[PDB]
Design a protein around this ligand. Structure first.
Ligand SMILES: CO[C@@H]1[C@@H](OC(N)=O)[C@@H](O)[C@H](Oc2ccc3c(O)c(NC(=O)c4ccc(O)c(CC=C(C)C)c4)c(=O)oc3c2C)OC1(C)C
Ligand SMILES: CO[C@@H]1[C@@H](OC(N)=O)[C@@H](O)[C@H](Oc2ccc3c(O)c(NC(=O)c4ccc(O)c(CC=C(C)C)c4)c(=O)oc3c2C)OC1(C)C
Lengths: 384, 384
């Protein structure tokens, strides 16, 4: 009643162990992974454009502006690097270091997990003047690497096309809505990165590009809401090995929304970077306020929830060796991320507040009126 | 340049991909995994007592009185079964379907990841009248399996002793509090299971056992507050392949706490079981009220969030093939769980109210107070 599953065999034996489930969520994790492989080329500074296309046959194509996955032979394995990448469960090396990378995702490079769980996979590489092609199916090579033609231009890059295996996912098909949502997210987290979504079926096409990045992301969060000031603030900075990006904006409403990210993956339960943000923001507001005489009688302006009212913000950090609560996602634990965020946002917020006095007053003013409202509801509720 | 990592080599090459990080959380996941292996025997019905002892040298011993990991040879590999389970990255088969299992552990069986990340591991098996022993170090056999004597009093079971690899975690050491916390949780989730913690480093002892299960869990969740009744309700039932257990109590206070679990692991982001719980509870509560004539007309209408004030409950389900939203689990997606919790809870709850009309209307009126209190705070705030 027992056997050893070697390599990709294990992935097909227990798919849920690699993608959580075999439903709609798991189906799209394949898309996210291949997309993140492309996004990693952008993070490294080689890709500037990424195309995601839903083909009429249900398959999905992800093409990048990158270097193109290497096709030269790996001595130890006696096979092209691109073949090894998509056929071995876990491959690594120093190539994992030297640039920020998307965190979480599928086992190892993740690409081979997608291949194992796909009826067919086609990898095309434009590199060193040629257009290469290798085809797989459920983890195995069906068509060995070969040159199918010459590369145009100075065109280099990788184009991956795959179709999740119906033997595992049933009649599931890609959902344009979900694909667009992740593309919209990425464009925001990698400002300047152009991502195009093509849905051949409906002949639709949308471009996702935003130089404003996270600041724009913050405004996007307050879509149907009256803004306190139409221009969202952007805080950029680097501390140690951590790149920090924070964007925020206020609305005259009373709802809030703070999204946090670590290496391009949502961190629902926050972590060191989120706690460092709330803290730094609080430090800055209060400090500035006193200096400028915005506080009278020493009212209860803080209390955290008061400052959160009508606050829309996005905190994003990038760091090597990220540490998560468990299973590479959820809550960021790196203390250095906390120090980076706190450091970068505190100093910069002070400046932003000083050069934008009116706005600073309105937001601090809103915090006081929020505290009072809290007080009134408390007594009222503690009356009956 | 590229390196293919075969088997356990990949675990030591990149531990965070298997345990999330190499700090305190990752360290304890090793403990959680070995404990889960023992608990699986209890879930299968062959184990009643698990001992967890923190040794003075930092190693952790986990002993269960279950069947004992088999030691016969696996012809396909030419090694005893115990060896295979602890030294191969992924082994599986029909044994995975024997019964309910703890979900979301470490890769595959999980034990081999622990072994790979420990400077040493000793596995003792009491089976078929004999006491077997086999030792490992960083994923590899150091002392092959051998019989070291008779099984004392013919007992059967597995005793695992291991020490997380200092080269991976530095000077970190198991935290008794984290251990007791998980042991307490498990005692509640598997009512009747007895777990003993011996903290030799502090000469301590402690028993975790509670036939009250999830009901007691709800009670202890509300420790500190005055209850509306000190006897927790217990709803248990099986619908399809899903076993459900829900416990709940009410306090005179205003705070609330609802914990959910799927196959022994916390689902902080809810899922089908949670949604179904509140719907079944809400339907049974509002229907009973109408039936017994409690829905007055001279006031506000009780809604969600109103009937969950001062309500402490724990919703726990066990089912085969759990489906989560990939990630770090977080949300249960199986529609069968929802129908299971709904069916089982709704009906049983209906009888609870009819059998406790006193408490029944005491709960409804409490929802009424919360309704007005909620609208009193609204008025107050809109008044600013
Ligand atoms: C799924 O494959 C991904 C890539 O995905 C995409 N879409 O381009 C990308 O995320 C990243 O791609 C890399 C990662 C590292 C190098 C990299 O180190 C290069 N540098 C070299 O000089 C080089 C040249 C030839 C060669 O055989 C190797 C080692 C082989 C590798 C990295 C597969 C390296 C290079 O030219 O391309 C690279 C590329 C395209 O990592 C992979 C391979 C897992
Ligand atoms: C890390 O080991 C764990 C176990 O932990 C402990 N402490 O018991 C436990 O969680 C579960 O333990 C099982 C799981 C299934 C069977 C099981 O199916 C049994 N039934 C047999 O008749 C049997 C007899 C000989 C044999 O080689 C095998 C299959 C081999 C196995 C389960 C490793 C099965 C049995 O005797 O013991 C079993 C045991 C002890 O699964 C493991 C092996 C991954």
């Amino acid at each position: 009643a027992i056997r050893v599953l070697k390599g990709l065999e294990g992935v097909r034996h227990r798919p849920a162990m690699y993608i959580g489930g075999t439903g709609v969520e798991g189906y799209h994790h394949l898309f996210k992974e291949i997309l993140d492989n492309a996004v990693d080329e952008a993070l490294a500074g080689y890709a500037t454009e990424i195309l995601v296309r839903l083909n009429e046959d249900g398959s999905l194509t992800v093409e990048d502006n990158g270097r193109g996955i290497p096709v030269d032979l790996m001595p130890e394995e006696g096979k092209p690097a691109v073949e090894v990448i998509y056929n071995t469960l876990h491959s690594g090396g120093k190539f994992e270091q030297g640039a920020y990378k998307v965190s979480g995702g599928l086992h190892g490079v993740g690409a081979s997990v997608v291949n194992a769980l796909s009826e067919w996979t086609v990898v095309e590489v434009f590199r060193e003047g040629k257009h290469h092609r290798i085809a797989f199916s459920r983890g195995e090579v069906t068509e060995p690497l070969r040159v199918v033609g010459e590369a145009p231009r100075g065109k280099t890059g990788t184009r991956v096309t795959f179709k999740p295996d119906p033997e595992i996912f049933g009649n599931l098909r890609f959902d344009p809505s979900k694909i667009r949502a992740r593309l919209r997210e990425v464009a925001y987290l990698v400002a300047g990165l152009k991502l195009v979504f093509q849905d051949r079926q409906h002949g639709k096409e949308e471009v996702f590009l935003d130089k404003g990045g996270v600041a724009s992301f913050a405004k996007a969060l307050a879509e149907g809401e009256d803004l306190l000031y139409e221009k969202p603030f952007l805080i950029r900075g680097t501390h140690g090995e951590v790149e920090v990006e924070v964007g925020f904006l206020h609305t005259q409403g009373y709802n809030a929304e703070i999204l946090t990210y670590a290496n391009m993956i949502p961190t629902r339960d926050g972590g060191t970077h989120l706690t460092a943000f709330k803290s730094a923001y609080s430090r800055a507001l209060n400090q500035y306020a006193k200096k400028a005489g915005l506080n009278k009688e020493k009212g209860p302006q803080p209390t955290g929830d008061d400052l959160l009212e009508g606050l829309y913000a996005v905190v994003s950090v990038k760091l090597p060796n990220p540490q998560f609560e468990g299973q590479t996602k959820g809550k960021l634990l790196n203390p250095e991320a906390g120090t980076a965020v706190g450091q970068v946002v505190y100093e910069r917020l002070l400046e932003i507040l000083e050069e934008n006095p009116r706005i600073a007053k309105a937001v601090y003013e809103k915090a006081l009126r929020a505290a009072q409202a809290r007080e009134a509801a408390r007594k009222a509720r503690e009356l009956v």
